[PDB]
Each structure stands twice: as structure tokens, then as C-alpha cells.
Design a protein around this ligand. Sequence first.
Ligand code: HEC
Ligand code: HEC
Ligand SMILES: [Zn+2]
Ligand SMILES: [Zn+2]
Lengths: 136, 136
Amino acid sequence: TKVKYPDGFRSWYHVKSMVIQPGHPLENPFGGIHHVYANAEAIQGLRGGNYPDGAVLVFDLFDYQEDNHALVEGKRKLIGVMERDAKRFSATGGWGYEGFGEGKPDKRLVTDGGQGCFGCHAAQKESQYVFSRLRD
Amino acid sequence: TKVKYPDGFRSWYHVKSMVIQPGHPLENPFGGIHHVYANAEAIQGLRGGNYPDGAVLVFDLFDYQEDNHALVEGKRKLIGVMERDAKRFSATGGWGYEGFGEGKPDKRLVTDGGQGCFGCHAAQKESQYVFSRLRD
Ligand code: HEC
Ligand code: HEC
Ligand SMILES: [Zn+2]
Ligand SMILES: [Zn+2]
């Protein structure tokens, strides 16, 4: 019913990264450097299989500072989490969506059952609602 | 005494990332988005422990493209590798240095036994020649 905080996500597989700079549509609140991490079961789905129950993807979002044309990671702003469970999260296409302020377990950001997250991720219906792709 | 290509490095622990843009003093040759990875032995060293022989750090460098206020990962330009062996790599501080063009095992880049890489990393004598720091 509630998405579990993904303890230990930092030791998971790093899928990819991207920088969202001021002026981008997603600036509020997804601006900054973000890294995507996937647990073992999520890798399964990324590689072409079905996503099994228990698959977790994390969007790890850092602020950054521009210093002499380098962008340097600052503080973590939040994580976004998608947890796969076809039964429990059926209202939102089988993924549960949560945000944790500053990456802390006690700071839950979503107040609408995850419908707002779901509304945009629904555009990737064809890829099981996941935008990120494996790269080497 | 060649550095081994670090097979499977992409499933290692992601330490940190940084973006180096035009203007920054290191644009040539390290411009792009880079990610740092570490195997289990290197984490022992990064944690404040000592570095076991067999510790490997990888600098994975990507070109990026500007897309509407986002920087998006493009193609891999190269990986830099530091491989810990106090006796084998005595001449450059106990770390062997190698570059692989586009991350390819066949594209070895280093021609001078690693002297040029070591000359800059030698600035970090007091952290055992490693610039990166663990973060959360
Ligand atoms: C469009 C308006 C979005 C809304 C609202 C949300 N997300 Fe999102 N998300 C979006 C894109 C374009 C991406 C890909 C970023 C990239 O580097 O390519 C993402 C990514 C995620 C991920 C990583 C997995 C993936 O689908 O690629 C997670 C775990 C994720 N998003 C979670 C999430 C949550 C919990 C949201 C509401 C708080 C949410 N997203 C909103 C686009 C959009
Ligand atoms: C200064 C002119 C440099 C030269 C020449 C080389 N490297 Fe380097 N390296 C440099 C910095 C400032 C950093 C840290 C980047 C960051 O995000 O903090 C690095 C990092 C590495 C790493 C990751 C481990 C670490 O020390 O932080 C590796 C594996 C590494 N560098 C390898 C490497 C090799 C193989 C080189 C010659 C081909 C080389 N470096 C040159 C600065 C400089
Ligand atoms: Zn604009
Ligand atoms: Zn700039």
C-alpha cells in the first residue's frame, strides 16, 4: 500500500545519468544531476524480460554547483522510487510511486496515491512505464 | 605489468559523477560527463581503510549533447583505470594507470608506463593518489 524505502539502493546497478538544468520543463522539482539505479529484478525488465514483482528503480537527484564550467554534485535533493507489484499497485499500472525528501525515509513527497507521477510515466506504456534504457 | 581491462566494471559501486564543460581547464582531454566506479577492494580503501592489492578504480568518460536545458549522455570516449599493486606498480605510486579508447580492451592508450597520468594524480599523495571521495 505504501512504497517501501529502498534501503541499500546506492550499491545497486547504475543504469544511467542525466543533467536537468534551469529552464527545462522538468526543472520543478526534478532539476539537478540525477542517477538511475536498478535492483536485480529491475535489470531483468530493463534487459527485455517482464518486470517481476519486487523490481525497484530509483531516481537519485542531486543539486549541483557550476564552478569554472564544471558541474559538481552538491546535496541530495530527493529520490524518486518505483516499486513493482502488479496486484498492490494496480491502480497505477503495477508500479508504486513515492518520493523521499533528501533521500530520508521519513520525508514522503507523494500525496495523491502516485497519480501525478503515473500521469507522465503513462506515456511509456509501451515500455512498462520506464523511460530509462540500458546503455553499456 | 600491464593493467587488466576491468571486465564487469559497470556492475561495480558508483562512487560519484562530475561534468566538465568547455572553458574548464581539463576540457582537453577529460571534457564530458564522467562516472567513477570502484570494486570491493577499492571501497575498503575509499572508506578510510587501506587499499588492498587488486583494488581498481574506473573513470568512465562520456561525451554529452545539449538538449533543451538537459545534458544527455552520448558516446563513451574512454575509460581510465587505476589498478592497485604496491610491488608491481611501485614506479607510479603502487597504482598502474591505463586508458582504453572508447572503453575497448584493444584500444590501450598509455605509452609511457603511466608517468603522465601519475604526474597529475601525485598531487593527491596524501589520499593514496585518489581524488574521488565517497559520498552518501
Ligand atoms: C513527466 C512530467 C514526469 C513526471 C511527473 C515524473 N516523471 Fe519520473 N521520469 C521522467 C522521465 C523523462 C524520466 C527519465 C529520466 C532519464 O534519465 O531518462 C523519469 C525517470 C524516473 C525513474 C527512473 C526510471 C525510469 O522510468 O526511467 C523513477 C524511479 C521515476 N521517474 C519516479 C517518479 C516518481 C516517484 C514521480 C512522482 C513523484 C515521477 N517519476 C514523476 C518523467 C516524469
Ligand atoms: C590532471 C591533469 C589529471 C591527469 C593527467 C589524469 N587524471 Fe585521472 N583524475 C583527475 C581528477 C581531478 C580526478 C577526479 C575526478 C572527479 O570526479 O573527482 C581524476 C580521477 C581518476 C580516476 C577515478 C579515481 C580518482 O582518483 O578519483 C581514475 C581511475 C583516473 N583518474 C585515472 C587516470 C589515468 C588512467 C590517467 C592517464 C591516462 C589519468 N587519470 C590522468 C586528474 C587527472
Ligand atoms: Zn530555453
Ligand atoms: Zn558554464
